[PDB]
Write a protein that holds these residues in place. Sequence first.
Motif, PDB file in Angstrom:
ATOM      1  N   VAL A 193      20.254  48.353   8.051  1.00 39.70           N
ATOM      2  CA  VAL A 193      19.007  48.809   8.675  1.00 39.70           C
ATOM      3  C   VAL A 193      19.309  49.346  10.069  1.00 39.70           C
ATOM      4  O   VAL A 193      20.043  48.702  10.838  1.00 39.70           O
ATOM      5  CB  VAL A 193      18.016  47.632   8.739  1.00 39.70           C
ATOM      6  N   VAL A 194      18.763  50.503  10.423  1.00 37.73           N
ATOM      7  CA  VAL A 194      19.006  51.148  11.715  1.00 37.73           C
ATOM      8  C   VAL A 194      17.766  50.974  12.568  1.00 37.73           C
ATOM      9  O   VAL A 194      16.694  51.484  12.185  1.00 37.73           O
ATOM     10  CB  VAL A 194      19.341  52.654  11.526  1.00 37.73           C
ATOM     11  N   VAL A 195      17.933  50.260  13.693  1.00 38.49           N
ATOM     12  CA  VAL A 195      16.766  49.947  14.544  1.00 38.49           C
ATOM     13  C   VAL A 195      17.040  50.386  15.965  1.00 38.49           C
ATOM     14  O   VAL A 195      18.169  50.723  16.321  1.00 38.49           O
ATOM     15  CB  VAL A 195      16.390  48.433  14.477  1.00 38.49           C
ATOM     16  N   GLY A 196      15.978  50.422  16.773  1.00 36.27           N
ATOM     17  CA  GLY A 196      16.105  50.880  18.154  1.00 36.27           C
ATOM     18  C   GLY A 196      14.905  51.724  18.541  1.00 36.27           C
ATOM     19  O   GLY A 196      14.098  52.138  17.694  1.00 36.27           O
ATOM     20  N   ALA A 197      14.841  52.023  19.824  1.00 34.19           N
ATOM     21  CA  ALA A 197      13.702  52.760  20.383  1.00 34.19           C
ATOM     22  C   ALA A 197      13.518  54.161  19.774  1.00 34.19           C
ATOM     23  O   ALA A 197      14.465  54.733  19.218  1.00 34.19           O
ATOM     24  CB  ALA A 197      13.881  52.871  21.912  1.00 34.19           C
ATOM     25  N   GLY A 198      12.329  54.761  19.975  1.00 31.86           N
ATOM     26  CA  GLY A 198      12.112  56.114  19.500  1.00 31.86           C
ATOM     27  C   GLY A 198      13.007  57.101  20.243  1.00 31.86           C
ATOM     28  O   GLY A 198      13.260  56.944  21.439  1.00 31.86           O
ATOM     29  N   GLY A 199      13.514  58.069  19.527  1.00 30.65           N
ATOM     30  CA  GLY A 199      14.281  59.154  20.125  1.00 30.65           C
ATOM     31  C   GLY A 199      15.729  58.868  20.417  1.00 30.65           C
ATOM     32  O   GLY A 199      16.415  59.759  20.937  1.00 30.65           O
ATOM     33  N   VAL A 200      16.237  57.707  19.952  1.00 26.86           N
ATOM     34  CA  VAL A 200      17.653  57.389  20.258  1.00 26.86           C
ATOM     35  C   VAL A 200      18.652  58.095  19.338  1.00 26.86           C
ATOM     36  O   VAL A 200      19.836  58.121  19.652  1.00 26.86           O
ATOM     37  CB  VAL A 200      17.961  55.875  20.312  1.00 26.86           C
ATOM     38  N   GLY A 201      18.167  58.571  18.193  1.00 30.25           N
ATOM     39  CA  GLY A 201      18.985  59.251  17.187  1.00 30.25           C
ATOM     40  C   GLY A 201      19.218  58.438  15.912  1.00 30.25           C
ATOM     41  O   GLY A 201      20.211  58.672  15.202  1.00 30.25           O
ATOM     42  N   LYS A 202      18.307  57.519  15.562  1.00 31.20           N
ATOM     43  CA  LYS A 202      18.430  56.746  14.320  1.00 31.20           C
ATOM     44  C   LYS A 202      18.449  57.656  13.110  1.00 31.20           C
ATOM     45  O   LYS A 202      19.322  57.519  12.237  1.00 31.20           O
ATOM     46  CB  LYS A 202      17.323  55.706  14.174  1.00 31.20           C
ATOM     47  N   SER A 203      17.501  58.591  13.063  1.00 34.29           N
ATOM     48  CA  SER A 203      17.460  59.494  11.896  1.00 34.29           C
ATOM     49  C   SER A 203      18.647  60.449  11.902  1.00 34.29           C
ATOM     50  O   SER A 203      19.226  60.712  10.847  1.00 34.29           O
ATOM     51  CB  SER A 203      16.161  60.287  11.866  1.00 34.29           C
ATOM     52  N   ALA A 204      18.999  60.965  13.077  1.00 37.93           N
ATOM     53  CA  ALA A 204      20.165  61.868  13.141  1.00 37.93           C
ATOM     54  C   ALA A 204      21.453  61.167  12.718  1.00 37.93           C
ATOM     55  O   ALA A 204      22.292  61.763  12.008  1.00 37.93           O
ATOM     56  CB  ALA A 204      20.297  62.516  14.526  1.00 37.93           C
ATOM     57  N   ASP A 237       7.757  41.961   8.019  1.00 42.26           N
ATOM     58  CA  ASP A 237       8.804  40.962   8.290  1.00 42.26           C
ATOM     59  C   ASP A 237       9.674  40.769   7.040  1.00 42.26           C
ATOM     60  O   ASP A 237      10.897  40.692   7.139  1.00 42.26           O
ATOM     61  CB  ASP A 237       8.182  39.616   8.664  1.00 42.26           C
ATOM     62  N   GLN A 238       9.030  40.732   5.853  1.00 37.58           N
ATOM     63  CA  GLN A 238       9.775  40.555   4.592  1.00 37.58           C
ATOM     64  C   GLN A 238      10.618  41.792   4.283  1.00 37.58           C
ATOM     65  O   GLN A 238      11.776  41.656   3.888  1.00 37.58           O
ATOM     66  CB  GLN A 238       8.820  40.206   3.424  1.00 37.58           C
ATOM     67  N   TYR A 239      10.104  42.986   4.591  1.00 36.53           N
ATOM     68  CA  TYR A 239      10.870  44.223   4.384  1.00 36.53           C
ATOM     69  C   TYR A 239      12.126  44.236   5.278  1.00 36.53           C
ATOM     70  O   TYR A 239      13.244  44.541   4.810  1.00 36.53           O
ATOM     71  CB  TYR A 239       9.978  45.425   4.683  1.00 36.53           C
ATOM     72  N   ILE A 269      15.164  40.728  14.721  1.00 29.14           N
ATOM     73  CA  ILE A 269      16.072  40.507  13.589  1.00 29.14           C
ATOM     74  C   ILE A 269      16.292  39.002  13.437  1.00 29.14           C
ATOM     75  O   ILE A 269      16.121  38.452  12.337  1.00 29.14           O
ATOM     76  CB  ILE A 269      17.397  41.241  13.823  1.00 29.14           C
ATOM     77  N   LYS A 270      16.647  38.326  14.547  1.00 27.11           N
ATOM     78  CA  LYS A 270      16.929  36.888  14.445  1.00 27.11           C
ATOM     79  C   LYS A 270      15.651  36.109  14.019  1.00 27.11           C
ATOM     80  O   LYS A 270      15.720  35.130  13.273  1.00 27.11           O
ATOM     81  CB  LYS A 270      17.411  36.361  15.798  1.00 27.11           C
ATOM     82  N   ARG A 271      14.469  36.571  14.478  1.00 27.91           N
ATOM     83  CA  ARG A 271      13.180  35.943  14.116  1.00 27.91           C
ATOM     84  C   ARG A 271      12.931  35.989  12.606  1.00 27.91           C
ATOM     85  O   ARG A 271      12.639  34.939  12.007  1.00 27.91           O
ATOM     86  CB  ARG A 271      11.997  36.629  14.845  1.00 27.91           C
ATOM     87  N   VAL A 272      13.066  37.190  11.980  1.00 30.57           N
ATOM     88  CA  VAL A 272      12.786  37.292  10.552  1.00 30.57           C
ATOM     89  C   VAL A 272      13.907  36.740   9.691  1.00 30.57           C
ATOM     90  O   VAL A 272      13.607  36.284   8.592  1.00 30.57           O
ATOM     91  CB  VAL A 272      12.392  38.715  10.097  1.00 30.57           C
ATOM     92  N   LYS A 273      15.150  36.790  10.142  1.00 28.43           N
ATOM     93  CA  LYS A 273      16.256  36.286   9.307  1.00 28.43           C
ATOM     94  C   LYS A 273      16.353  34.744   9.467  1.00 28.43           C
ATOM     95  O   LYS A 273      16.904  34.091   8.601  1.00 28.43           O
ATOM     96  CB  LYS A 273      17.600  36.984   9.641  1.00 28.43           C
ATOM     97  N   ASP A 274      15.827  34.175  10.567  1.00 21.54           N
ATOM     98  CA  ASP A 274      15.850  32.734  10.827  1.00 21.54           C
ATOM     99  C   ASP A 274      17.293  32.270  10.936  1.00 21.54           C
ATOM    100  O   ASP A 274      17.732  31.291  10.295  1.00 21.54           O
ATOM    101  CB  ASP A 274      15.086  31.946   9.744  1.00 21.54           C
ATOM    102  N   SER A 275      18.041  33.001  11.750  1.00 21.05           N
ATOM    103  CA  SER A 275      19.439  32.721  11.932  1.00 21.05           C
ATOM    104  C   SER A 275      19.913  33.247  13.255  1.00 21.05           C
ATOM    105  O   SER A 275      19.452  34.297  13.732  1.00 21.05           O
ATOM    106  CB  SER A 275      20.253  33.373  10.820  1.00 21.05           C
ATOM    107  N   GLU A 276      20.877  32.528  13.819  1.00 16.78           N
ATOM    108  CA  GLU A 276      21.550  32.937  15.036  1.00 16.78           C
ATOM    109  C   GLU A 276      22.795  33.783  14.706  1.00 16.78           C
ATOM    110  O   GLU A 276      23.437  34.267  15.643  1.00 16.78           O
ATOM    111  CB  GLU A 276      21.988  31.694  15.836  1.00 16.78           C
ATOM    112  N   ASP A 277      23.166  33.952  13.395  1.00 12.68           N
ATOM    113  CA  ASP A 277      24.331  34.730  12.989  1.00 12.68           C
ATOM    114  C   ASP A 277      23.997  35.841  11.975  1.00 12.68           C
ATOM    115  O   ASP A 277      24.180  35.659  10.769  1.00 12.68           O
ATOM    116  CB  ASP A 277      25.413  33.820  12.406  1.00 12.68           C
ATOM    117  N   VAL A 278      23.495  36.971  12.459  1.00 12.97           N
ATOM    118  CA  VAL A 278      23.180  38.100  11.584  1.00 12.97           C
ATOM    119  C   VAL A 278      24.121  39.229  11.901  1.00 12.97           C
ATOM    120  O   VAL A 278      24.259  39.600  13.068  1.00 12.97           O
ATOM    121  CB  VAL A 278      21.733  38.579  11.839  1.00 12.97           C
TER     122      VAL A 278
END
Length: 169
Positions: free
Chosen positions: A7-18, A69-71, A100-109
């Motif tokens: 999964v590619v995450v981050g602010a708008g305009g950083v180049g996730k889609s590119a 959150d499930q997605y 990420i850590k909130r939905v995965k419920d882990s300190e190691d993702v």
Amino acid sequence: MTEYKLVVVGAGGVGKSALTIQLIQNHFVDEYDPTIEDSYRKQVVIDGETCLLDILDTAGQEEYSAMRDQYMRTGEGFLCVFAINNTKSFEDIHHYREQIKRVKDSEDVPMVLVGNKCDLPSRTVDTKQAQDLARSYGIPFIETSAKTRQGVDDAFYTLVREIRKHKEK
Ligand SMILES: C#Cc1c(F)ccc2cc(O)cc(-c3ncc4c(N5C[C@H]6CC[C@@H](C5)N6C(=O)[C@@H]5OC(=O)C5(C)C)nc(OC[C@@]56CCCN5C[C@H](F)C6)nc4c3F)c12
Ligand SMILES: Nc1nc2c(ncn2[C@@H]2O[C@H](COP(=O)(O)OP(=O)(O)O)[C@@H](O)[C@H]2O)c(=O)[nH]1
Ligand SMILES: [Mg+2]
């Protein structure tokens, strides 16, 4: 055949889609609808293993439903992307790491910190700042350009290697 959900995450305009399109199509796309969230598959061989990489390029209005959150929880590894010419995008990395850590419920993702747009001369986030943030999270840091393809394969393949290491624990 092994599939990896990235999964590619981050602010708008950083180049996730590119970044996503440079990985899947080997082309730089100047305009990709900023509102559109979609996924793509790429079959690749990494360290001798034939992989199916399913990349989810995140986008859309900021929302936090139980379904979202499930997605996001389907992700096995995350690229946390900021742009080297945008200090706010770098400052937002903590938020994405924590969701990420909130939905995965882990300190190691499995995660990789990506500093994109490295082809531009206007750098406001120095390499040291990002290397320090990545060392504080225990994750790799890679600088990329979706325009020139610098570092793109390295960022995604390093995230697959982090997922493999995690599965062995
Ligand atoms: C990701 C993620 C995420 C995970 F990694 C893991 C679990 C998640 C579980 C969840 O349920 C939800 C999310 C989630 N979904 C969307 C998010 C999002 N978008 C999506 C993208 C990026 C910015 C803007 C709004 N975008 C767009 O694509 C916009 O659509 C457009 O067009 C743009 C205008 C380009 N924004 C933010 O935070 C933005 C900031 C700045 C303002 C307040 N907010 C708080 C901080 F400060 C930071 N956070 C988000 C967030 F956490 C999860
Ligand atoms: N110079 C340059 N521009 C990029 C790069 N990545 C993305 N862009 C540009 O930055 C803008 C936002 O990119 P996009 O992929 O839509 O960002 P997203 O909102 O994170 O999906 C577009 O005008 C892209 O052409 C890069 O590495 N170098
Ligand atoms: Mg996009």
